[PDB]
Amino acid sequence: IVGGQECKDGECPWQALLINEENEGFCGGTILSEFYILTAAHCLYQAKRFKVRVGDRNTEQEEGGEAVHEVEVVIKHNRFTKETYDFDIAVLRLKTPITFRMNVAPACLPERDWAESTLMTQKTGIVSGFGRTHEKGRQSTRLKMLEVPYVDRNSCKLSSSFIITQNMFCAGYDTKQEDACQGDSGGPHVTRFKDTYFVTGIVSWGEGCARKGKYGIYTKVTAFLKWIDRSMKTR
């Protein structure tokens, strides 16, 4: 997360961090239920074996309120391709149930139509993670969040040096130095509605971090809703 504020106690409970055997946090994730985690598919390429962590806000000050979980099954989207970042989604079925407490709660899955009509038409959304603070910088030790305005789909395609598919959408700023960054991949993008947050996008990619004239590219969750349900039945 470049810019943005710090996730204050209880503000980003649906956050999840994928960690390698070296125990380093490399990607993000969203808590859907006690058994399922949502993430980017390209993230299942930045580590051999990895666990998923929840309830953490400071990767060094053992808040004692954290909890690590093992992955039983990784459900990667078949049509996912690295050469286009299309279908950049994935679902993780946990080995043990996540116990919900402070800083550990699930984000809501919205209805496909309502979402596109009332959620993505909202002025902004929230993206969060333990990713780099700057393009060249280092991974963050604290969990951050950033209000990123929804970007016009046309402005998006125009500013992009790559094909922005139907499975993606832009969010962020043209010039302001704020946007997700490395390590934030797979993390959550949520939209607020009457004090309830709904999942809307999976941190996918970008051309650099917070560069002038470039936006943040997220996976369009509403375009994979049904796929996600199917996965909740492990398929």
Partner: protein, 51 residues
Amino acid sequence: KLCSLDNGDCDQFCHEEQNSVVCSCARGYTLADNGKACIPTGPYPCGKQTL
């Protein structure tokens, strides 16, 4: 009808059933009696900051 008015005055999901509006809630909520509001069923409902 008119879920485009003010979300139909629903707390969450809004659907227009030909005539009027039909509100619904995410998994883990139950529609209030006014057929609009959503109420949690457990202590950690999806979408709520835990404070």
